[PDB]
Design a protein around this ligand. Structure first.
Ligand code: 7LD
Ligand SMILES: OC[C@H]1O[C@H](O[C@H]2[C@H](O)[C@@H](O)[C@@H](O)O[C@@H]2CO)[C@H](O)[C@@H](O)[C@@H]1O
Lengths: 341, 270, 171, 124, 202
């Protein structure tokens, strides 16, 4: 069985076994939807260690890896002899013929955004930084502005999806697309994704858990990074998705979409505060940076000598010549240094 | 006809005095009027205007009535006071226009940079310039009944530093203000048309009533003062133009001190 | 920072007499969730910390005598004592804890009683005081009912046991 | 005459959001500034936010990023969003309309403002 | 029962720092929030600062924001108030008061208050008190020549309470304070913490 929106159907339902990427298993295990199956050493030996590392979370093994998937540039040899090496040359080649991929899912367009340095949940000192969300940096901004510029240049449709892209590529209409190993059974040549601003594309590597093509896939993978396993990924993805729906459709600018994504990523903010920040970013983008700074500030808020006298009538204590003279004056006004009478 | 001339001139002096005194009283009596920094400039202007009606106009009026200059050993100081007051009023108008432009173009920076200290410094600079151009040359015999003939170079320099440059500054200031207002009105009209000229005409009429009055009042006087030394024109027309430039002092508060706030102040004061 | 005001600055009433004090607020302090007005009264005796008497402007605290009653709404509140006891001589402060915590000016209450006769006494300066050069004689008048009897004087606060003042004067 | 009808103020828990709205009825010149000020009991009236007809906005150093002012396209309706409210934000919020109809001066219109209270109680 | 004590007060110069401390006992200090309040004759009661249970949110007054800093140490059940840039108006008696849990649901405001510490700010130096016994039935003792206000007197070490009258101190012409403690019988002890003096009148 393969119900639609499986990643979104499973949470509300919890099938005996689920076959999906490991990035979603984090949120599932955070609430206790997946059963902790006990693995065997003989079963761990027959599998690669990097797969176990990718599927590892909180120091425990959740499910068994099946295979490694990564995006690659699939082009038709009948249309062009060699594939473009840099994104900047696609706008030209395209206009010389007249690239098309899934514009709805953010996983297909994230490589272009992260090519120039876009990142999320930075991996520092061997751990992910949930507070350091760099989806609003210069790299992601350049990637998304280039994406919307290509969309506006009559190069890619704003409503295209995986089905339309596949149907157009099978008929020989489009010259190239971006797809992973799952599209080979339905479909030529495949290669690494083109570079952007000199920097290489960073596609996420989705390891499923419970030859020249493989070479290109592994090269795209090692050029990218493995998807995190923190529960904050799923929601984050949705945020990015909205940005995509806010970028290709032209509903708002790039800065507004990135600010919306940043606000949606913050889980600690309630619904009312989230809507307030969204409206603040809508009605005033001039200070959007300060608004995001205040939103972050609020995110960490809702996160779950002495003298002794022994006279005949006056006795007790009170508080070297510089002090002895003052003590003598005080004693005179009263009618360790000790004085008695 | 001399009697009628006297009547008219006296009426003008009395109206100028009454306007200046009313403006000064309405400004110094209420606190919310002095809260605005720009109003300070107006005060200076008013003060200058007041002097024009006290130490300048009455003496010339009585001299023209009598037909000569009875005030012996007073012509030099009188001409000095006249030049000082004229330069002070012109520079006050110029700085008022500059302040209005700075407030309209960039109000966020105007509210933070323009402070009472800055207004006082500008007023003091204008007064010192007026003094340096009026008293220093006259007392040192550089400008040379009484008629006070004028040299060519000194007259040209005074007309250039006290009328031409401030006039050009005010012209460019009002031009920038008009361009900004026209851009805003065009934006509003485009928005209204997308949602589905009287404002520009009103702005033009306001700018005209503001500038053209002083222009027609003070242009021919300086033109004659610059043409006569080079040579001719008669003294009657020169005196008429001087009286027009002086009546401009009385007309000033009607243009610069007749807004809604000043109207309410005059209504609640009397 | 809601400001509160107490109209009675200082008043004196006889023992057992029904007294009342009003309090004015600058704005409403009603909570829309529980529909409870957030206002409280504190009692501070001479030489003691404030003591909570009534909270919510309607509910009396534990251990507080029943003579104290709180009422009102909106911006007008009232604290009434049906029988002011001699032990009730203290300062009453209104306080609000919905918005930023602020306190009022305080209402000083005094006890009126009969005209008690004062006991007079005099003490010359001791030898130890004359040694320093001071010769200030000390006059003392205990048990004054009224507060009025190089010189300086000091009056003791009206004790909550006999309700009588005591004065002293020195040169 | 120019009328300013303000609304949206009231009681709100700390950290919440609130949207105040001021409708300006009457003939207003193009060049004009619309701002929101706050006045607390005992203290003086201070500036909170302002916006010019050209789209530029200005905020104070204590409300920068937290508060956001905006104006409508043609309705001349001013909106003020406030997020992450603090206990010290309770005050009377007035709407100041500075009109430059007379180039030689400016006219200030007020609408008497509205009260805003920020709670500090704890729950659960 | 709930008990709160304060310490750290005394005589300090304007602009100097002061770390007032408060010790709480008889309850789970870690659960209840704390408030520092101050009272003076010129302003009456005036809330100064507030700290929550977990030190997540801290609130300060309008005239003290930035100058004072409130904190708490739960492992030792202690509260601290660091006052800096002390002005002339900061002189007052400072009390600590707990905050009942979830006042929004139950409405219980600050109920338990400490003993309070008097803080005085001035450029003058400390000065020990001088006692003068005034014998006559009634006998008194005059405490003079002491600038700091905090001072207490106990007749016969507190053996009796009836008939004792400690007159409030007044500002002497020389800038010092003077008071009288008289007992009407049918020796005492005077303590002055700011100068740390324990004197016997007779
Ligand atoms: C016919 C003779 N008279 C009168 C005695 C003048 O020329 C006056 C001289 C003036 C004069 C000279 C030089 C510089 C100046 N700035 C401003 C004025 C000014 C004013 C101007 N007044 C109006 C006339
Ligand atoms: O919506 C984006 C989507 O991306 C991922 O799923 C990829 C996955 O890498 C492949 O197994 C294949 O199914 O293509 C998918 C594109 O939809 C993430 O695993 C998922 O969380 C995310 O929603």
């Amino acid at each position: 069985e393969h119900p639609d929106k499986l990643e979104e159907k499973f949470p509300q339902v919890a099938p005996d076994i689920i076959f999906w990427a490991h990035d979603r298993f984090g949120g599932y295990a955070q609430s206790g939807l997946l059963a902790e199956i006990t693995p065997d050493k003989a079963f761990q030996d027959k599998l690669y260690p990097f797969t176990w590392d990718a599927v590892r979370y909180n120091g425990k093994l959740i499910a068994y890896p099946i295979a490694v998937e990564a995006l690659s540039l699939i082009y038709n040899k009948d249309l062009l002899p060699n594939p473009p090496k840099t994104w900047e040359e696609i706008p030209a080649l395209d206009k010389e013929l007249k690239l098309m991929f899934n514009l709805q899912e953010p996983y297909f367009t994230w490589p272009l955004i992260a090519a120039d340095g876009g990142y999320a949940f930075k991996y520092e000192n061997g751990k992910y930084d949930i507070k350091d969300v760099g989806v609003d940096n210069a790299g992601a901004k350049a990637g998304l502005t280039f994406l919307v510029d290509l969309i506006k240049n009559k190069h890619m449709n704003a409503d295209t999806d995986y089905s339309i892209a596949e149907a157009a590529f099978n008929k020989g209409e489009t010259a190239m697309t971006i797809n992973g190993p799952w599209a080979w059974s339905n479909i030529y040549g495949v290669t690494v994704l083109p570079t952007f601003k000199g920097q290489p594309s960073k596609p996420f590597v989705g390891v499923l858990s419970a030859d020249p093509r493989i070479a290109a896939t592994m090269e795209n993978a090692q050029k990218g990074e493995i998807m995190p396993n923190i529960p904050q990924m799923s929601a984050f993805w949705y945020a990015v998705r909205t940005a995509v729906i806010n970028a290709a459709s032209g509903r708002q600018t790039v800065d507004q979409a990135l600010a919306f994504a940043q606000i949606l990523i913050m889980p600690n903010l309630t619904e009312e505060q989230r809507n307030g920040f969204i409206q603040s970013l809508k009605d005033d983008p001039s200070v959007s940076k300060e608004i995001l700074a205040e939103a972050k500030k609020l995110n960490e808020h809702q996160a779950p000598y002495k003298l002794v006298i022994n006279g005949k009538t006056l006795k007790g204590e009170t508080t070297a010549e510089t002090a002895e003279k003052a003590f003598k004056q005080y004693a005179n006004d009263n009618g360790t240094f000790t004085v008695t009478e | 006809v001399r009697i009628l001339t006297a009547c008219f001139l006296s009426l003008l002096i009395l109206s100028t005095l009454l306007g200046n005194t009313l403006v000064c009283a309405a400004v110094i009596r209420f606190r919310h009027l002095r809260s605005k920094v720009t109003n300070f400039f107006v005060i200076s202007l008013a003060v200058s205007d007041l002097l024009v009606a006290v130490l300048v106009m009455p003496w010339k009026a009585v001299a023209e009535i009598a037909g000569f200059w009875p005030f012996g050993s007073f012509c030099n100081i009188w001409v000095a006071f006249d030049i000082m007051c004229s330069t002070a009023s012109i520079w006050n108008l110029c700085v008022i226009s500059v302040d209005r432009y700075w407030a309209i173009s960039s109000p966020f920076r105007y509210e933070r940079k323009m402070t009472p200290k800055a207004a006082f410094i500008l007023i003091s600079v204008a007064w010192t310039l007026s003094v340096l151009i009026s008293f220093i040359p006259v007392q040192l015999s550089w400008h040379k009944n009484c008629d006070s003939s004028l040299s060519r170079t000194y007259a040209i320099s005074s007309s250039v530093i006290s009328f031409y440059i401030p006039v050009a500054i005010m012209i460019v200031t009002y031009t920038r203000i008009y361009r900004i207002a026209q851009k805003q009105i065009r934006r509003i009209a485009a928005l209204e048309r997308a949602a589905v000229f009287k404002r520009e005409t009103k702005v033009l009429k306001t700018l005209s009533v503001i500038m053209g009055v002083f222009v027609c009042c003070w242009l021919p006087f300086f033109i004659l003062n610059c043409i006569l030394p080079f040579c001719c024109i008669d003294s009657n027309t020169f005196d008429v133009f001087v009286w027009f430039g002086w009546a401009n002092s009385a007309l000033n508060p009607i243009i610069y001190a007749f807004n809604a706030d000043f109207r309410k102040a005059f209504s609640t004061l009397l | 920072n809601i400001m509160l005001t107490q109209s009675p600055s200082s008043l004196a009433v006889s023992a057992g007499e029904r007294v009342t004090m009003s309090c004015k607020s600058t704005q409403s302090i009603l909570y829309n969730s529980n529909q409870k007005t957030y206002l409280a009264w504190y009692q501070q005796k001479p030489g003691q910390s404030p003591k909570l008497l009534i909270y919510w402007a309607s509910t009396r605290a534990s251990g507080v005598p029943d003579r104290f009653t709180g009422s009102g709404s909106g911006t007008d509140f009232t604290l009434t004592i049906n029988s002011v006891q001699p032990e009730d001589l203290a300062v009453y402060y209104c306080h609000q804890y919905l918005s930023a915590w602020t306190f009022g000016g305080g209402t000083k209450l005094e006890i009126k009683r009969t005209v008690a006769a004062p006991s007079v006494f005099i003490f010359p300066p001791s030898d130890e005081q004359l040694k320093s050069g001071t010769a200030s004689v000390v006059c003392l008048l205990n048990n004054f009912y009224p507060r009025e009897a190089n010189s300086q004087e000091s009056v003791t606060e009206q004790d909550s046991k006999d309700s009588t003042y005591s004065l002293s004067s020195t040169l | 005459q120019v009328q300013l009808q303000e609304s949206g103020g009231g009681l709100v828990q700390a950290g919440g959001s609130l949207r105040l709205s001021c409708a300006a009825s009457g003939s207003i010149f193009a060049l004009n500034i619309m701002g929101w000020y706050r006045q607390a009991p005992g203290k003086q009236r201070e500036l909170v936010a302002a916006i010019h007809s050209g789209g530029t906005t200005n905020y104070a150093n204590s409300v920068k990023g937290r508060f956001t002012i905006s104006r409508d396209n043609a309705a001349n309706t001013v909106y003020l969003q406030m997020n992450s409210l603090k206990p010290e934000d309770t005050a009377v919020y007035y709407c100041n309309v500075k009109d430059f109809g007379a180039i030689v001066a400016d006219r200030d219109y007020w609408g008497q403002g509205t009260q805003v209270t920020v709670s500090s109680l704890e729950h659960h | 029962d709930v008990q709160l004590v304060e310490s750290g007060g005394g005589l300090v110069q304007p602009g100097k720092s002061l770390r007032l401390s408060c010790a709480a006992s008889g309850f789970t200090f870690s659960n209840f929030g704390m408030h520092w309040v101050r009272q003076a004759p010129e302003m009456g009661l005036e809330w100064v600062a507030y700290i929550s249970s977990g030190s997540t949110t801290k609130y300060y007054g309008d005239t003290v924001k930035g100058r004072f800093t409130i904190s708490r140490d739960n492992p030792k059940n202690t509260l601290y108030l660091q006052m800096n840039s002390l002005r002339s108006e900061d002189t007052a008696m400072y009390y600590c008061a707990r905050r009942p849990l979830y006042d929004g649901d139950y409405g219980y405001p600050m109920d338990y208050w400490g003993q309070g510490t008097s803080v005085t700010v001035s450029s003058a130096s400390t000065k020990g008190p001088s006692v003068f016994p005034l014998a006559p039935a009634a006998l008194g003792c005059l405490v003079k020549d002491y600038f700091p206000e905090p001072v207490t007197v106990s007749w016969n070490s507190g053996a009796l309470t009836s008939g004792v009258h400690t007159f409030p101190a007044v500002l002497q012409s020389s800038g010092l304070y003077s008071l009288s403690s008289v007992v009407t019988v049918p020796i005492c002890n005077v303590n002055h913490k700011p100068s740390n003096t324990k004197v016997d009148k007779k």
